[PDB]
């Protein structure tokens, strides 16, 4: 890979203060700005039932791998032109792996 | 993706006569030349317990997604230098996909 496993508890955290704000990571966790997290590791972009999501994302048709992620969180309007995922990104990978660490983790 | 849904009887015939020879795909299939592939997908490259991997493999440490598995199979060795799986690898992305999309059903 080009992601190296980072702390859980570190991407725990990142996570409640950079994600939560607009996901849920939880089996049954309800979409709110951004769509529901569960089981997106092996799925394509914008899939989730019940979100509206831009065209540009369903049309991305990325196929998330904790690789992909790593770009998406980077720069997500730079990896999606059209997303209106409206994050700046997570820049130093360091974070991104603790983050993914925890999203591959959680949202199993 | 760069990947596209192909035919997953096609599919199940191209692994039948390209890959069978050295693979299973049954969950509880055992290694034969070839590591069996159950349960590949998301999993790194060179992780199967009891297999015997080439140390090349181990360290590409290739996270394997359809996307992935689509330039692994196109040349092996190009894309993997020094494995030693002797084949010389599919060029159509038609049966690429074809068997990709019968290896993601039947590896699940
Ligand atoms: C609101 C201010 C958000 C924050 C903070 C984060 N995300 Fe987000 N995300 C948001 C939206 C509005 C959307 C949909 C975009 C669209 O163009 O429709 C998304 C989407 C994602 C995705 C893609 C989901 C898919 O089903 O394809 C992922 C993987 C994702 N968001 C993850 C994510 C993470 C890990 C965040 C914290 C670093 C995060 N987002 C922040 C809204 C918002
Ligand atoms: C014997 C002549 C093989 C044929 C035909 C195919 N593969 Fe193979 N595969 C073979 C070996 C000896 C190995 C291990 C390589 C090493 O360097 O140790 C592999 C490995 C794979 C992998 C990687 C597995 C992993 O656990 O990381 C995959 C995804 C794979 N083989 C798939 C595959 C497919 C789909 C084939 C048909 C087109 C196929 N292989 C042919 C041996 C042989």
Known sequence: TEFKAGSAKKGATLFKTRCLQCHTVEKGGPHKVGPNLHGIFGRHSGQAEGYS?????????????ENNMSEYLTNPKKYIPGTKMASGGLKKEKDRNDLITYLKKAAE
Do not use: F
């Not at 540009?56 to 791998?65: Q, R, S």
């Open 53 to 65: 999501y831009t065209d540009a994302i369903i049309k991305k048709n990325v196929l998330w791998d």
